[PDB]
Amino acid sequence: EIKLKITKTIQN
Amino acid sequence: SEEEDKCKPMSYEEKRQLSLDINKLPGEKLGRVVHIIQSREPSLKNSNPDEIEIDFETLKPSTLRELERYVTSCLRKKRKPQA
């Protein structure tokens, strides 16, 4: 049970 | 050559630390890994690129060794361009 929600590449 | 794509899975410690090592990559460098997993693991290419869903227990052994090998190449340096 390992999840990596990499939060990035969000438009600016 | 074949040691990367025909590799065996890493341990729970390593998989977890791999989640942590990608977390260390600045957004620029980070964008590669998000792409790597999505490219190697079709099942999660449905994940929004901004909030990608990685399941370290389902990633192929070669995916893990591409993720780890890539990040370690960055961590082992002065990785502060965007951080």
PDB file of N, CA and C in Angstrom:
ATOM      1  N   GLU A   1       0.841  -1.218   0.000  1.00  0.00           N
ATOM      2  CA  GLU A   1       0.000   0.000   0.000  1.00  0.00           C
ATOM      3  C   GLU A   1       0.868   1.258   0.000  1.00  0.00           C
ATOM      4  N   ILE A   2       1.357   1.642  -1.175  1.00  0.00           N
ATOM      5  CA  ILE A   2       2.181   2.838  -1.310  1.00  0.00           C
ATOM      6  C   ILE A   2       1.772   3.631  -2.547  1.00  0.00           C
ATOM      7  N   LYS A   3       1.292   4.848  -2.325  1.00  0.00           N
ATOM      8  CA  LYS A   3       0.869   5.722  -3.411  1.00  0.00           C
ATOM      9  C   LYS A   3       1.682   7.008  -3.411  1.00  0.00           C
ATOM     10  N   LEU A   4       2.196   7.387  -4.573  1.00  0.00           N
ATOM     11  CA  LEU A   4       2.936   8.634  -4.694  1.00  0.00           C
ATOM     12  C   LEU A   4       2.157   9.616  -5.554  1.00  0.00           C
ATOM     13  N   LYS A   5       1.422  10.498  -4.906  1.00  0.00           N
ATOM     14  CA  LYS A   5       0.763  11.585  -5.600  1.00  0.00           C
ATOM     15  C   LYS A   5       1.750  12.714  -5.833  1.00  0.00           C
ATOM     16  N   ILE A   6       2.553  12.611  -6.883  1.00  0.00           N
ATOM     17  CA  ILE A   6       3.464  13.695  -7.196  1.00  0.00           C
ATOM     18  C   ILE A   6       2.664  14.877  -7.721  1.00  0.00           C
ATOM     19  N   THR A   7       2.586  15.931  -6.937  1.00  0.00           N
ATOM     20  CA  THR A   7       1.825  17.107  -7.318  1.00  0.00           C
ATOM     21  C   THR A   7       2.734  18.137  -7.987  1.00  0.00           C
ATOM     22  N   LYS A   8       2.665  18.229  -9.315  1.00  0.00           N
ATOM     23  CA  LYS A   8       3.507  19.165 -10.056  1.00  0.00           C
ATOM     24  C   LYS A   8       3.011  19.337 -11.492  1.00  0.00           C
ATOM     25  N   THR A   9       3.819  20.014 -12.314  1.00  0.00           N
ATOM     26  CA  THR A   9       3.497  20.341 -13.714  1.00  0.00           C
ATOM     27  C   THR A   9       2.224  21.180 -13.824  1.00  0.00           C
ATOM     28  N   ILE A  10       1.817  21.775 -12.710  1.00  0.00           N
ATOM     29  CA  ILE A  10       0.623  22.603 -12.673  1.00  0.00           C
ATOM     30  C   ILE A  10       0.847  23.887 -13.470  1.00  0.00           C
ATOM     31  N   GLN A  11      -0.093  24.191 -14.354  1.00  0.00           N
ATOM     32  CA  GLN A  11       0.004  25.361 -15.215  1.00  0.00           C
ATOM     33  C   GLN A  11      -0.016  26.645 -14.398  1.00  0.00           C
ATOM     34  N   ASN A  12       0.794  27.603 -14.811  1.00  0.00           N
ATOM     35  CA  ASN A  12       0.873  28.882 -14.132  1.00  0.00           C
ATOM     36  C   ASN A  12       0.624  30.012 -15.119  1.00  0.00           C
TER      37      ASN A  12
ATOM     38  N   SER B   1      22.836  -2.995 -20.133  1.00  0.00           N
ATOM     39  CA  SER B   1      21.838  -3.037 -21.220  1.00  0.00           C
ATOM     40  C   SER B   1      20.569  -3.776 -20.777  1.00  0.00           C
ATOM     41  N   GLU B   2      20.710  -5.030 -20.351  1.00  0.00           N
ATOM     42  CA  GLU B   2      19.548  -5.841 -19.992  1.00  0.00           C
ATOM     43  C   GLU B   2      19.290  -5.825 -18.487  1.00  0.00           C
ATOM     44  N   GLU B   3      20.195  -5.227 -17.730  1.00  0.00           N
ATOM     45  CA  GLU B   3      20.085  -5.234 -16.276  1.00  0.00           C
ATOM     46  C   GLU B   3      19.014  -4.256 -15.802  1.00  0.00           C
ATOM     47  N   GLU B   4      18.627  -3.334 -16.669  1.00  0.00           N
ATOM     48  CA  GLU B   4      17.626  -2.340 -16.310  1.00  0.00           C
ATOM     49  C   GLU B   4      16.205  -2.834 -16.606  1.00  0.00           C
ATOM     50  N   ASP B   5      15.981  -3.413 -17.788  1.00  0.00           N
ATOM     51  CA  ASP B   5      14.630  -3.803 -18.186  1.00  0.00           C
ATOM     52  C   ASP B   5      14.308  -5.232 -17.756  1.00  0.00           C
ATOM     53  N   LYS B   6      15.331  -5.995 -17.389  1.00  0.00           N
ATOM     54  CA  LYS B   6      15.136  -7.371 -16.945  1.00  0.00           C
ATOM     55  C   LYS B   6      15.592  -7.506 -15.494  1.00  0.00           C
ATOM     56  N   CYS B   7      15.371  -6.444 -14.741  1.00  0.00           N
ATOM     57  CA  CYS B   7      15.771  -6.391 -13.339  1.00  0.00           C
ATOM     58  C   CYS B   7      14.702  -7.014 -12.446  1.00  0.00           C
ATOM     59  N   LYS B   8      15.099  -7.357 -11.227  1.00  0.00           N
ATOM     60  CA  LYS B   8      14.173  -7.834 -10.210  1.00  0.00           C
ATOM     61  C   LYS B   8      13.712  -6.663  -9.342  1.00  0.00           C
ATOM     62  N   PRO B   9      12.539  -6.791  -8.693  1.00  0.00           N
ATOM     63  CA  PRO B   9      11.975  -5.722  -7.864  1.00  0.00           C
ATOM     64  C   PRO B   9      12.833  -5.408  -6.649  1.00  0.00           C
ATOM     65  N   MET B  10      12.827  -4.148  -6.254  1.00  0.00           N
ATOM     66  CA  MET B  10      13.504  -3.725  -5.044  1.00  0.00           C
ATOM     67  C   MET B  10      12.580  -3.909  -3.844  1.00  0.00           C
ATOM     68  N   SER B  11      13.151  -3.845  -2.653  1.00  0.00           N
ATOM     69  CA  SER B  11      12.417  -4.118  -1.423  1.00  0.00           C
ATOM     70  C   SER B  11      11.439  -2.995  -1.065  1.00  0.00           C
ATOM     71  N   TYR B  12      10.651  -3.221  -0.020  1.00  0.00           N
ATOM     72  CA  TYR B  12       9.669  -2.242   0.447  1.00  0.00           C
ATOM     73  C   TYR B  12      10.370  -0.954   0.883  1.00  0.00           C
ATOM     74  N   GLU B  13      11.510  -1.106   1.553  1.00  0.00           N
ATOM     75  CA  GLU B  13      12.292   0.037   2.018  1.00  0.00           C
ATOM     76  C   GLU B  13      12.697   0.890   0.818  1.00  0.00           C
ATOM     77  N   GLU B  14      13.158   0.219  -0.227  1.00  0.00           N
ATOM     78  CA  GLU B  14      13.684   0.896  -1.407  1.00  0.00           C
ATOM     79  C   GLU B  14      12.565   1.558  -2.204  1.00  0.00           C
ATOM     80  N   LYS B  15      11.464   0.836  -2.398  1.00  0.00           N
ATOM     81  CA  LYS B  15      10.291   1.384  -3.076  1.00  0.00           C
ATOM     82  C   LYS B  15       9.794   2.642  -2.368  1.00  0.00           C
ATOM     83  N   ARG B  16       9.741   2.576  -1.046  1.00  0.00           N
ATOM     84  CA  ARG B  16       9.305   3.705  -0.238  1.00  0.00           C
ATOM     85  C   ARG B  16      10.295   4.864  -0.330  1.00  0.00           C
ATOM     86  N   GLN B  17      11.587   4.558  -0.247  1.00  0.00           N
ATOM     87  CA  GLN B  17      12.612   5.582  -0.354  1.00  0.00           C
ATOM     88  C   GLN B  17      12.625   6.182  -1.755  1.00  0.00           C
ATOM     89  N   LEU B  18      12.194   5.393  -2.725  1.00  0.00           N
ATOM     90  CA  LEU B  18      12.096   5.837  -4.111  1.00  0.00           C
ATOM     91  C   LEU B  18      10.964   6.850  -4.242  1.00  0.00           C
ATOM     92  N   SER B  19       9.901   6.624  -3.506  1.00  0.00           N
ATOM     93  CA  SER B  19       8.825   7.596  -3.449  1.00  0.00           C
ATOM     94  C   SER B  19       9.347   8.895  -2.837  1.00  0.00           C
ATOM     95  N   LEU B  20      10.289   8.740  -1.924  1.00  0.00           N
ATOM     96  CA  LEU B  20      10.874   9.860  -1.220  1.00  0.00           C
ATOM     97  C   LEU B  20      11.940  10.568  -2.054  1.00  0.00           C
ATOM     98  N   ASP B  21      12.629   9.820  -2.911  1.00  0.00           N
ATOM     99  CA  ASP B  21      13.706  10.389  -3.714  1.00  0.00           C
ATOM    100  C   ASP B  21      13.160  11.187  -4.901  1.00  0.00           C
ATOM    101  N   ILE B  22      12.018  10.768  -5.436  1.00  0.00           N
ATOM    102  CA  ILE B  22      11.346  11.530  -6.486  1.00  0.00           C
ATOM    103  C   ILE B  22      10.737  12.795  -5.905  1.00  0.00           C
ATOM    104  N   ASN B  23      10.281  12.685  -4.664  1.00  0.00           N
ATOM    105  CA  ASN B  23       9.755  13.821  -3.924  1.00  0.00           C
ATOM    106  C   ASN B  23      10.829  14.907  -3.767  1.00  0.00           C
ATOM    107  N   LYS B  24      12.092  14.502  -3.880  1.00  0.00           N
ATOM    108  CA  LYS B  24      13.218  15.415  -3.704  1.00  0.00           C
ATOM    109  C   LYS B  24      13.531  16.192  -4.975  1.00  0.00           C
ATOM    110  N   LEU B  25      13.185  15.625  -6.117  1.00  0.00           N
ATOM    111  CA  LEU B  25      13.441  16.274  -7.396  1.00  0.00           C
ATOM    112  C   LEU B  25      12.627  17.555  -7.542  1.00  0.00           C
ATOM    113  N   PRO B  26      13.291  18.673  -7.889  1.00  0.00           N
ATOM    114  CA  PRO B  26      12.603  19.926  -8.220  1.00  0.00           C
ATOM    115  C   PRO B  26      11.639  19.727  -9.384  1.00  0.00           C
ATOM    116  N   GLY B  27      10.559  20.516  -9.417  1.00  0.00           N
ATOM    117  CA  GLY B  27       9.496  20.348 -10.410  1.00  0.00           C
ATOM    118  C   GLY B  27       9.995  20.034 -11.812  1.00  0.00           C
ATOM    119  N   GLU B  28      11.000  20.775 -12.261  1.00  0.00           N
ATOM    120  CA  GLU B  28      11.622  20.551 -13.566  1.00  0.00           C
ATOM    121  C   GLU B  28      12.067  19.092 -13.726  1.00  0.00           C
ATOM    122  N   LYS B  29      12.938  18.652 -12.832  1.00  0.00           N
ATOM    123  CA  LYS B  29      13.469  17.294 -12.859  1.00  0.00           C
ATOM    124  C   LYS B  29      12.374  16.275 -12.562  1.00  0.00           C
ATOM    125  N   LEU B  30      11.468  16.676 -11.696  1.00  0.00           N
ATOM    126  CA  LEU B  30      10.348  15.849 -11.268  1.00  0.00           C
ATOM    127  C   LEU B  30       9.451  15.466 -12.441  1.00  0.00           C
ATOM    128  N   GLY B  31       9.209  16.410 -13.345  1.00  0.00           N
ATOM    129  CA  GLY B  31       8.325  16.162 -14.478  1.00  0.00           C
ATOM    130  C   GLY B  31       8.734  14.953 -15.305  1.00  0.00           C
ATOM    131  N   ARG B  32      10.020  14.623 -15.295  1.00  0.00           N
ATOM    132  CA  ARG B  32      10.507  13.444 -16.002  1.00  0.00           C
ATOM    133  C   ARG B  32       9.941  12.171 -15.389  1.00  0.00           C
ATOM    134  N   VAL B  33      10.007  12.064 -14.068  1.00  0.00           N
ATOM    135  CA  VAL B  33       9.608  10.837 -13.378  1.00  0.00           C
ATOM    136  C   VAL B  33       8.121  10.591 -13.523  1.00  0.00           C
ATOM    137  N   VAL B  34       7.319  11.625 -13.280  1.00  0.00           N
ATOM    138  CA  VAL B  34       5.869  11.533 -13.485  1.00  0.00           C
ATOM    139  C   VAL B  34       5.586  10.974 -14.875  1.00  0.00           C
ATOM    140  N   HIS B  35       6.379  11.427 -15.834  1.00  0.00           N
ATOM    141  CA  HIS B  35       6.269  10.957 -17.207  1.00  0.00           C
ATOM    142  C   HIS B  35       6.750   9.509 -17.341  1.00  0.00           C
ATOM    143  N   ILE B  36       7.869   9.180 -16.691  1.00  0.00           N
ATOM    144  CA  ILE B  36       8.430   7.830 -16.764  1.00  0.00           C
ATOM    145  C   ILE B  36       7.407   6.789 -16.332  1.00  0.00           C
ATOM    146  N   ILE B  37       6.846   6.957 -15.137  1.00  0.00           N
ATOM    147  CA  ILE B  37       5.886   5.989 -14.619  1.00  0.00           C
ATOM    148  C   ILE B  37       4.682   5.873 -15.552  1.00  0.00           C
ATOM    149  N   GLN B  38       4.109   7.012 -15.918  1.00  0.00           N
ATOM    150  CA  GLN B  38       2.958   7.049 -16.825  1.00  0.00           C
ATOM    151  C   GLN B  38       3.259   6.373 -18.166  1.00  0.00           C
ATOM    152  N   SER B  39       4.508   6.446 -18.600  1.00  0.00           N
ATOM    153  CA  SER B  39       4.919   5.836 -19.860  1.00  0.00           C
ATOM    154  C   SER B  39       5.101   4.323 -19.719  1.00  0.00           C
ATOM    155  N   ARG B  40       5.586   3.880 -18.564  1.00  0.00           N
ATOM    156  CA  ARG B  40       5.884   2.466 -18.365  1.00  0.00           C
ATOM    157  C   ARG B  40       4.679   1.715 -17.820  1.00  0.00           C
ATOM    158  N   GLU B  41       3.855   2.411 -17.054  1.00  0.00           N
ATOM    159  CA  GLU B  41       2.667   1.813 -16.453  1.00  0.00           C
ATOM    160  C   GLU B  41       1.372   2.371 -17.057  1.00  0.00           C
ATOM    161  N   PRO B  42       0.979   1.909 -18.268  1.00  0.00           N
ATOM    162  CA  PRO B  42      -0.282   2.314 -18.921  1.00  0.00           C
ATOM    163  C   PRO B  42      -1.500   2.424 -17.987  1.00  0.00           C
ATOM    164  N   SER B  43      -1.576   1.565 -16.979  1.00  0.00           N
ATOM    165  CA  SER B  43      -2.737   1.498 -16.099  1.00  0.00           C
ATOM    166  C   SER B  43      -2.957   2.795 -15.320  1.00  0.00           C
ATOM    167  N   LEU B  44      -1.920   3.614 -15.201  1.00  0.00           N
ATOM    168  CA  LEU B  44      -2.041   4.865 -14.467  1.00  0.00           C
ATOM    169  C   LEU B  44      -1.811   6.070 -15.370  1.00  0.00           C
ATOM    170  N   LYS B  45      -1.825   5.857 -16.682  1.00  0.00           N
ATOM    171  CA  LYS B  45      -1.679   6.972 -17.619  1.00  0.00           C
ATOM    172  C   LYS B  45      -2.990   7.753 -17.696  1.00  0.00           C
ATOM    173  N   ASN B  46      -3.994   7.243 -16.992  1.00  0.00           N
ATOM    174  CA  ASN B  46      -5.278   7.914 -16.863  1.00  0.00           C
ATOM    175  C   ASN B  46      -5.225   8.964 -15.757  1.00  0.00           C
ATOM    176  N   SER B  47      -4.136   8.959 -14.996  1.00  0.00           N
ATOM    177  CA  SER B  47      -3.960   9.907 -13.910  1.00  0.00           C
ATOM    178  C   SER B  47      -3.684  11.299 -14.468  1.00  0.00           C
ATOM    179  N   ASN B  48      -4.309  12.312 -13.875  1.00  0.00           N
ATOM    180  CA  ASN B  48      -4.048  13.690 -14.267  1.00  0.00           C
ATOM    181  C   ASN B  48      -2.580  13.991 -14.023  1.00  0.00           C
ATOM    182  N   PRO B  49      -1.886  14.563 -15.019  1.00  0.00           N
ATOM    183  CA  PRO B  49      -0.440  14.784 -14.944  1.00  0.00           C
ATOM    184  C   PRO B  49      -0.038  15.688 -13.787  1.00  0.00           C
ATOM    185  N   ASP B  50      -0.982  16.467 -13.280  1.00  0.00           N
ATOM    186  CA  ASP B  50      -0.708  17.367 -12.168  1.00  0.00           C
ATOM    187  C   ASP B  50      -0.758  16.606 -10.843  1.00  0.00           C
ATOM    188  N   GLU B  51      -1.625  15.598 -10.787  1.00  0.00           N
ATOM    189  CA  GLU B  51      -1.870  14.818  -9.575  1.00  0.00           C
ATOM    190  C   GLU B  51      -1.809  13.339  -9.919  1.00  0.00           C
ATOM    191  N   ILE B  52      -0.633  12.870 -10.303  1.00  0.00           N
ATOM    192  CA  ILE B  52      -0.513  11.529 -10.837  1.00  0.00           C
ATOM    193  C   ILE B  52      -0.596  10.489  -9.730  1.00  0.00           C
ATOM    194  N   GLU B  53      -1.268   9.391 -10.028  1.00  0.00           N
ATOM    195  CA  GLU B  53      -1.478   8.336  -9.061  1.00  0.00           C
ATOM    196  C   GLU B  53      -0.467   7.215  -9.304  1.00  0.00           C
ATOM    197  N   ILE B  54       0.522   7.104  -8.435  1.00  0.00           N
ATOM    198  CA  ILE B  54       1.530   6.055  -8.560  1.00  0.00           C
ATOM    199  C   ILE B  54       1.277   4.962  -7.541  1.00  0.00           C
ATOM    200  N   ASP B  55       1.325   3.712  -7.977  1.00  0.00           N
ATOM    201  CA  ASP B  55       1.138   2.607  -7.056  1.00  0.00           C
ATOM    202  C   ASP B  55       2.377   1.738  -7.057  1.00  0.00           C
ATOM    203  N   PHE B  56       3.259   2.002  -6.103  1.00  0.00           N
ATOM    204  CA  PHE B  56       4.597   1.424  -6.098  1.00  0.00           C
ATOM    205  C   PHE B  56       4.592  -0.099  -6.005  1.00  0.00           C
ATOM    206  N   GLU B  57       3.453  -0.678  -5.665  1.00  0.00           N
ATOM    207  CA  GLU B  57       3.341  -2.120  -5.546  1.00  0.00           C
ATOM    208  C   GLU B  57       2.899  -2.756  -6.861  1.00  0.00           C
ATOM    209  N   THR B  58       2.677  -1.933  -7.874  1.00  0.00           N
ATOM    210  CA  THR B  58       2.241  -2.437  -9.169  1.00  0.00           C
ATOM    211  C   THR B  58       3.215  -2.066 -10.284  1.00  0.00           C
ATOM    212  N   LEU B  59       4.092  -1.099 -10.020  1.00  0.00           N
ATOM    213  CA  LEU B  59       5.073  -0.676 -11.018  1.00  0.00           C
ATOM    214  C   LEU B  59       5.997  -1.841 -11.349  1.00  0.00           C
ATOM    215  N   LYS B  60       6.337  -1.975 -12.617  1.00  0.00           N
ATOM    216  CA  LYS B  60       7.263  -3.003 -13.063  1.00  0.00           C
ATOM    217  C   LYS B  60       8.636  -2.786 -12.430  1.00  0.00           C
ATOM    218  N   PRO B  61       9.392  -3.873 -12.197  1.00  0.00           N
ATOM    219  CA  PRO B  61      10.723  -3.793 -11.584  1.00  0.00           C
ATOM    220  C   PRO B  61      11.650  -2.864 -12.359  1.00  0.00           C
ATOM    221  N   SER B  62      11.476  -2.843 -13.669  1.00  0.00           N
ATOM    222  CA  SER B  62      12.283  -2.006 -14.534  1.00  0.00           C
ATOM    223  C   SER B  62      11.883  -0.539 -14.385  1.00  0.00           C
ATOM    224  N   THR B  63      10.591  -0.300 -14.164  1.00  0.00           N
ATOM    225  CA  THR B  63      10.095   1.045 -13.912  1.00  0.00           C
ATOM    226  C   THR B  63      10.766   1.604 -12.670  1.00  0.00           C
ATOM    227  N   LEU B  64      10.766   0.812 -11.603  1.00  0.00           N
ATOM    228  CA  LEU B  64      11.403   1.201 -10.349  1.00  0.00           C
ATOM    229  C   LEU B  64      12.878   1.528 -10.553  1.00  0.00           C
ATOM    230  N   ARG B  65      13.550   0.745 -11.374  1.00  0.00           N
ATOM    231  CA  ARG B  65      14.979   0.923 -11.576  1.00  0.00           C
ATOM    232  C   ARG B  65      15.265   2.053 -12.553  1.00  0.00           C
ATOM    233  N   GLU B  66      14.244   2.499 -13.268  1.00  0.00           N
ATOM    234  CA  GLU B  66      14.368   3.669 -14.113  1.00  0.00           C
ATOM    235  C   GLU B  66      14.106   4.917 -13.284  1.00  0.00           C
ATOM    236  N   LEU B  67      13.169   4.799 -12.352  1.00  0.00           N
ATOM    237  CA  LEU B  67      12.814   5.895 -11.480  1.00  0.00           C
ATOM    238  C   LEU B  67      13.975   6.178 -10.537  1.00  0.00           C
ATOM    239  N   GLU B  68      14.448   5.118  -9.884  1.00  0.00           N
ATOM    240  CA  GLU B  68      15.510   5.229  -8.892  1.00  0.00           C
ATOM    241  C   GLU B  68      16.817   5.678  -9.537  1.00  0.00           C
ATOM    242  N   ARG B  69      17.205   5.000 -10.616  1.00  0.00           N
ATOM    243  CA  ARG B  69      18.456   5.319 -11.311  1.00  0.00           C
ATOM    244  C   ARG B  69      18.488   6.774 -11.763  1.00  0.00           C
ATOM    245  N   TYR B  70      17.339   7.285 -12.163  1.00  0.00           N
ATOM    246  CA  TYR B  70      17.253   8.645 -12.664  1.00  0.00           C
ATOM    247  C   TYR B  70      17.331   9.658 -11.527  1.00  0.00           C
ATOM    248  N   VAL B  71      16.573   9.429 -10.471  1.00  0.00           N
ATOM    249  CA  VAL B  71      16.530  10.375  -9.368  1.00  0.00           C
ATOM    250  C   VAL B  71      17.855  10.422  -8.630  1.00  0.00           C
ATOM    251  N   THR B  72      18.444   9.255  -8.391  1.00  0.00           N
ATOM    252  CA  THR B  72      19.710   9.172  -7.685  1.00  0.00           C
ATOM    253  C   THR B  72      20.794   9.938  -8.442  1.00  0.00           C
ATOM    254  N   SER B  73      20.660   9.995  -9.763  1.00  0.00           N
ATOM    255  CA  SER B  73      21.594  10.742 -10.590  1.00  0.00           C
ATOM    256  C   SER B  73      21.473  12.241 -10.293  1.00  0.00           C
ATOM    257  N   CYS B  74      20.285  12.640  -9.848  1.00  0.00           N
ATOM    258  CA  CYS B  74      19.991  14.031  -9.535  1.00  0.00           C
ATOM    259  C   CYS B  74      20.298  14.353  -8.065  1.00  0.00           C
ATOM    260  N   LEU B  75      19.787  13.520  -7.149  1.00  0.00           N
ATOM    261  CA  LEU B  75      20.006  13.693  -5.707  1.00  0.00           C
ATOM    262  C   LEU B  75      21.491  13.768  -5.367  1.00  0.00           C
ATOM    263  N   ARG B  76      22.290  12.965  -6.058  1.00  0.00           N
ATOM    264  CA  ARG B  76      23.730  12.890  -5.817  1.00  0.00           C
ATOM    265  C   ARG B  76      24.469  14.090  -6.408  1.00  0.00           C
ATOM    266  N   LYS B  77      23.770  15.208  -6.498  1.00  0.00           N
ATOM    267  CA  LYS B  77      24.313  16.431  -7.066  1.00  0.00           C
ATOM    268  C   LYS B  77      23.756  17.623  -6.305  1.00  0.00           C
ATOM    269  N   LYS B  78      24.078  18.826  -6.751  1.00  0.00           N
ATOM    270  CA  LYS B  78      23.551  20.024  -6.116  1.00  0.00           C
ATOM    271  C   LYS B  78      22.248  20.413  -6.796  1.00  0.00           C
ATOM    272  N   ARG B  79      21.207  19.651  -6.485  1.00  0.00           N
ATOM    273  CA  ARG B  79      19.921  19.771  -7.157  1.00  0.00           C
ATOM    274  C   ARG B  79      19.073  20.902  -6.584  1.00  0.00           C
ATOM    275  N   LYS B  80      19.506  22.128  -6.820  1.00  0.00           N
ATOM    276  CA  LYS B  80      18.772  23.290  -6.346  1.00  0.00           C
ATOM    277  C   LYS B  80      18.509  24.328  -7.452  1.00  0.00           C
ATOM    278  N   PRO B  81      18.095  23.918  -8.674  1.00  0.00           N
ATOM    279  CA  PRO B  81      17.783  24.876  -9.735  1.00  0.00           C
ATOM    280  C   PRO B  81      16.418  25.522  -9.519  1.00  0.00           C
ATOM    281  N   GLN B  82      15.474  24.714  -9.059  1.00  0.00           N
ATOM    282  CA  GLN B  82      14.125  25.172  -8.779  1.00  0.00           C
ATOM    283  C   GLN B  82      13.731  24.746  -7.362  1.00  0.00           C
ATOM    284  N   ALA B  83      14.721  24.686  -6.480  1.00  0.00           N
ATOM    285  CA  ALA B  83      14.498  24.267  -5.103  1.00  0.00           C
ATOM    286  C   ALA B  83      15.618  24.773  -4.204  1.00  0.00           C
TER     287      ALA B  83
END
